[PDB]
C-alpha cells in the first residue's frame, strides 16, 4: 500500500509510483493472489472445512485466512479489502462475530499442525500424481 | 461451512468535534512558535 488515500500498489494502475519506490513493477501483481485465493476458497474442500490458507507477503507479512471468509470476486474491491487489512491488521465480519482475515506473527511453523508434511510446487522437481501422494501420506498428519 | 461477508470501507480514512480538536492542536503548536 502507498498513500497517493492508501491504495494497493498495482502493476498496471500504478507504474510511476513504483518506479519512484525503485521496485521492479514486474513483481507488483496482486491479481495472481486474488485469483489463487478465489479458486482456492471456492473449492469444495473449503466447503467441506478441510483447508486453511496462509498468505506470506513478499515484505514478510503473514496473513491467516479463516475458511469462512469470502473475498470480493471483483479485483477492485479485493484491493480495498487488502488495504483495510494491512492497516488495521484485522478484518471483522459483517455480523461482527469473528475476525476473518488476521495478520499473525512469523514464523509460519508455529501456526501449522504439530505433525504436518511440507511441500512446495517446483517446476524443475519430479512430476507427481497429486492424488497418489495424498493416500500414501499418513492420516493424522496434514499436508 | 458457514459463510460470512467481510466488512470494510470503500475508502480508508486513518466526528467533527475531534476534527475541531485536531485543528486546535495544530493552531496551539504554531501560535506558541510565533510567540517564541
Amino acid at each position: 500500500t502507498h498513500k497517493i488515500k492508501y491504495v494497493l500498489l498495482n502493476c498496471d494502475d500504478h507504474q510511476g509510483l513504483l518506479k519512484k519506490m525503485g521496485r521492479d513493477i514486474s513483481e507488483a501483481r496482486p491479481d495472481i493472489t486474488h485469483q489463487c485465493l478465489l479458486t482456492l476458497l471456492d473449492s469444495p474442500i473449503n466447503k467441506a472445512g478441510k483447508l486453511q490458507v496462509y498468505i506470506q507477503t513478499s515484505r514478510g507479512i503473514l496473513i491467516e485466512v479463516n475458511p469462512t471468509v469470502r473475498i470480493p470476486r471483483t479485483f477492485k474491491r479485493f484491493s480495498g479489502l487488502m488495504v483495510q487489512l494491512l492497516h488495521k491488521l484485522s478484518i471483522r465480519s459483517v455480523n461482527s462475530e469473528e475476525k476473518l482475515l488476521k495478520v499473525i506473527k512469523n514464523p509460519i511453523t508455529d501456526h501449522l499442525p504439530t505433525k504436518c508434511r511440507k511441500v512446495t510446487l517446483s517446476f524443475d522437481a519430479p512430476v507427481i500424481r497429486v492424488q497418489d501422494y495424498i493416500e500414501k501420506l499418513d492420516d493424522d498428519e496434514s499436508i | 461451512i458457514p459463510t460470512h461477508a467481510p466488512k470494510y470501507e470503500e475508502n480508508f480514512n486513518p466526528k467533527m468535534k475531534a476534527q475541531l480538536k485536531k485543528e486546535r492542536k495544530f493552531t496551539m503548536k504554531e501560535i506558541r512558535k510565533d510567540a517564541k
Binding site: 469470502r70 470480493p72 470476486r73 471483483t74 474491491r77 | 461477508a5
Partner: peptide, 11 residues
C-alpha cells in the same frame, strides 16, 4: 445465504 459465484454486497 449466498451461493456459488455471488459477490459481496456493495453499498
Amino acid at each position: 445465504r449466498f451461493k456459488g459465484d455471488d459477490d459481496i454486497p456493495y453499498k
